[PDB]
Amino acid sequence: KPFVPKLVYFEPEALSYPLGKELYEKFTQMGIKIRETTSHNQVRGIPGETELARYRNAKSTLVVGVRRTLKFDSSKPSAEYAIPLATGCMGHCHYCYLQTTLGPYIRVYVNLDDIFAQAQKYINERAPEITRFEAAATSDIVGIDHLTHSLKKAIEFIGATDYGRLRFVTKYEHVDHLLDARHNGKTRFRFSINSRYVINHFEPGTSSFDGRLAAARKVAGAGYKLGFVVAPIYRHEGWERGYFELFQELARQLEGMDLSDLTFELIQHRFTKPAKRVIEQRYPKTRLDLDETKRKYKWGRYGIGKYVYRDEEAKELEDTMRRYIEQFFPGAYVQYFT
Ligand SMILES: C[C@@]1(Cc2cn([C@H]3C[C@H](O)[C@@H](CO)O3)c(=O)[nH]c2=O)CN([C@H]2C[C@H](O)[C@@H](CO)O2)C(=O)NC1=O
Ligand SMILES: C[Se@@+](CC[C@H](N)C(=O)O)C[C@H]1O[C@@H](n2cnc3c(N)ncnc32)[C@H](O)[C@@H]1O
Ligand code: SF4
After folding, report:
1. Structural domains of the chain ordered from first start
2. 94, 269 in Cβ contact below 8 A?
3. What is the best residue among 96, 194, 200, 230 to mutate for testing ligand 3's pocket, by most ligand atoms within 8 Å of CB?
4. Atom 7 of ligand 3, residue of closest alpha carbon
5. Residue 51's beta-bridge partner residues?
6. Is position 223 annotated in a ligand binding site?
7. What values do phi and psi take at 71, rounded to 5?
8. Which ligand has the minimum distance to the alpha carbon of residue 95?
9. Looking at ligand 2, which residue's alpha carbon is closest to its atom 23?
10. Cα-flanking dihedrals φ and ψ of residue 5, to 5°?
């Protein structure tokens, strides 16, 4: 059930680090097909004759490498920065924004000393103000972590700092190895949730809603700060009742738990102009409605723009989500709607 790659690439430089050495001996012991990248770290020869084939096989391929870009991206509204522990995902969410943000093997970085050292510099440059880090900005870091334990190390590193905070969101239940981690109350452990329609139709290759909630109870019992990310908020047929049933069912599955300091994050479905065509050839018979005529185009600033719902329909979603959260989780804090 936990993700295990069917193909692994190693950057030569990765073998100079403890994690690279450990992963090399791990995957060779497991008899998994292991390859070397070029001297300039390019991944060549991923199986597949069509574009869709190489996309599928890429999502079953792991690349063990070194993070050379030590400048951290900003990650608002979640956190000040994105801490780069991994890139890519094993899941096949039809709407996924990684389809345009990438183009899709799973990359993991081994130079944790360097990455954490850089994280500490960002913390020092803003202290005594709090600096939050998003570890799942460009990947499902939790779904990958049983292989590496990099997130666990990041959790404990952040736990040792005074002004640092960590956060990440996942669609996977494979969190057992993280339960005895010394988080020190400085990690927000979030789970992506959605209506039954969106999960059943658009989220294959992820854990079930029940699995995610089972995992959510485990992490909360281990003392982690708990939160949920309701995204993508998607106006499907019967969305108002669909999302009502979500929060009702969510409240039922978290019965008899300390839900003080529970957070919610709300993201409406969004897609870029290229995504329409890219998704059409990566998921041909998807029910995902990418009709531009029912959307508002929000023009980009430094990046490319994207379609979102019109201001009025967006407010319907926001007001509705806020109403259900207040009904089923009194005192819970909605961090943002975007
Ligand atoms: C898990 C995320 C992390 C995140 C990612 N990203 C990056 C990931 C990728 O490079 C890009 C996707 O448009 O945006 C970002 O800018 N801000 C974030 O807060 C995901 N998102 C993203 C996706 C959305 O387009 C953007 C704007 O809120 O933020 C978010 O709102 N909440 C989060 O907590
Ligand atoms: C890219 Se996701 C990375 C973390 C992890 N693999 C996870 O799925 O939780 C970050 C969040 O953003 C949502 N999301 C993904 N695509 C979109 C989208 N196109 N529109 C609107 N939201 C989109 C996902 O449901 C997640 O809640
Ligand atoms: S689990 Fe997250 S990162 Fe992975 S395909 Fe789904 S939305 Fe994308």
Report:
1. 1-111 (3.40.50.12110), 112-338 (3.80.30.30)
2. no
3. 96
4. 96
5. none
6. no
7. -75, 125
8. 2
9. 232
10. -70, 145
